[PDB]
Amino acid sequence: TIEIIAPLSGEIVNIEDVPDVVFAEKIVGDGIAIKPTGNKMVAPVDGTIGKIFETNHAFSIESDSGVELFVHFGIDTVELKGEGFKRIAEEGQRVKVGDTVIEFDLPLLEEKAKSTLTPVVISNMDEIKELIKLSGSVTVGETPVIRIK
Amino acid sequence: MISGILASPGIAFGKALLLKEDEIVIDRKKISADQVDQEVERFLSGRAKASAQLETIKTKAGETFGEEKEAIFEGHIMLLEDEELEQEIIALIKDKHMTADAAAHEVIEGQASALEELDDEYLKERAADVRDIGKRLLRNILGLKIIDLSAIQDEVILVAADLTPSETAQLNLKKVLGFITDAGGRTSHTSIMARSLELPAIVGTGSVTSQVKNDDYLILDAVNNQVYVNPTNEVIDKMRAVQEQVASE
Numbered sequence: 322t323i324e325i326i327a328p329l330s331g332e333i334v335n336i337e338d339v340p341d342v343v344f345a346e347k348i349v350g351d352g353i354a355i356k357p358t359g360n361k362m363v364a365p366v367d368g369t370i371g372k373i374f375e376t377n378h379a380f381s382i383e384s385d386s387g388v389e390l391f392v393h394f395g396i397d398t399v400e401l402k403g404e405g406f407k408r409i410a411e412e413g414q415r416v417k418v419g420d421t422v423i424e425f426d427l428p429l430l431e432e433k434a435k436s437t438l439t440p441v442v443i444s445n446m447d448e449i450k451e452l453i454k455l456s457g458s459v460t461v462g463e464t465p466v467i468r469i470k
Numbered sequence: 471m472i473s474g475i476l477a478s479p480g481i482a483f484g485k486a487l488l489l490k491e492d493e494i495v496i497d498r499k500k501i502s503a504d505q506v507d508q509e510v511e512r513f514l515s516g517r518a519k520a521s522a523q524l525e526t527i528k529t530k531a532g533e534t535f536g537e538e539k540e541a542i543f544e545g546h547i548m549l550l551e552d553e554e555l556e557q558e559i560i561a562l563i564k565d566k567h568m569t570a571d572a573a574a575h576e577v578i579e580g581q582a583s584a585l586e587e588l589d590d591e592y593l594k595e596r597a598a599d600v601r602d603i604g605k606r607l608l609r610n611i612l613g614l615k616i617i618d619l620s621a622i623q624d625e626v627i628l629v630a631a632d633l634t635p636s637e638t639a640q641l642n643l644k645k646v647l648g649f650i651t652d653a654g655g656r657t658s659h660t661s662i663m664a665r666s667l668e669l670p671a672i673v674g675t676g677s678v679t680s681q682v683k684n685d686d687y688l689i690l691d692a693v694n695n696q697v698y699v700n701p702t703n704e705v706i707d708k709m710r711a712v713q714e715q716v717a718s719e
């Protein structure tokens with residue numbers, strides 16, 4: 322059993338309730354969304370960072386346990402061209418749970434972003450036995466959000 | 471004196487590739503009842519190709535760029551196989567006795583047309599991706615020749631009026647020394663790709679493709695925002711001395 326730790330603080334939301342058909346229809350993988358309340362995005366697992374968007378608002382990480390995740394802050398946030406985000410980590414970086422990847426400006430994004438809803442999805446769906454979605458409020462790098470087998 | 475918006479600063483030297491596309495011809499002639507069954511089969515037979523060819527492009531995006539670009543094709547493919555399109559495309563042909571290329575165009579154009587009515591630049595771009603799916607479908611039914619940007623055996627610069635997300639996936643990054651286009655400016659993920667890829671490129675040229683022929687030798691300054699077409703050796707030597715200053719800087 323693999324526990325995915327919350328990459329940001331907030332409230333868990335259904336991925337189906339995200340205002341984006343590609344995520345809502347899980348074309349991109351399956352998982353949950355988080356209505357953010359903090360200021361930073363950390364590694365939800367021990368693994369290696371894969372790709373950081375040039376707008377520094379989303380990233381990919383592979384856990385050591387072999388799970389591929391994809392954390393994308395907000396909806397249509399690329400349109401802000403990097404405003405409100407600061408890449409803290411580097412592509413290829415090895416990380417442990419809780420390591421800071423990116424910091425963001427919530428209030429700014431709350432004002433400028435179409436939505437701050439943040440999908441956390443598994444992009445490896447075909448390699449996993451089960452995905453158990455959790456519920457509630459989470460605390461960055463502490464509270465588990467998904468359990469996988 | 472040609473100037474664009476310059477999306478990525480840098481310099482490059484190479485041949486120019488020109489993407490030429492013939493205009494798609496639509497038949498306004500109405501079909502007869504006996505032709506209703508045949509036109510549906512042509513659509514299914516033509517749709518049968520794009521089904522397998524679109525899937526091939528998806529696999530290239532996953533290995534080439536990653537899962538971030540692989541799933542975008544699944545949405546386009548999944549939308550194309552939407553059961554609403556099958557019934558709506560067939561109903562017009564069966565009900566209005568229209569042609570598959572003319573009837574199918576109305577269905578994809580009809581939805582994209584509704585999206586344009588939206589007063590948002592973000593929703594309008596997605597309508598561009600949906601429009602592209604129907605645009606190629608017409609070529610797939612007719613069976614028009616496709617250049618395919620993957621058939622590049624020599625390093626060249628990529629010049630086009632505008633590139634659709636579908637081309638960016640099946641695009642050879644190592645054989646393309648840069649990207650030049652006269653699109654709007656930000657464009658979908660394209661102009662954005664030059665930024666993230668960190669390669670020299672222009673997107674607001676305005677009319678460079680009409681001045682360039684394929685196999686033309688061009689030098690991209692991406693620093694003075696100028697393009698040199700067939701420059702003498704003395705001009706290159708002068709440009710090389712300036713490049714050395716930039717390296718020192």
Ligand SMILES: O=[P-]([O-])[O-]
Nearest residue numbers: 374379397398399
């Ligand atoms: O996937 P994206 O909107 O940066």
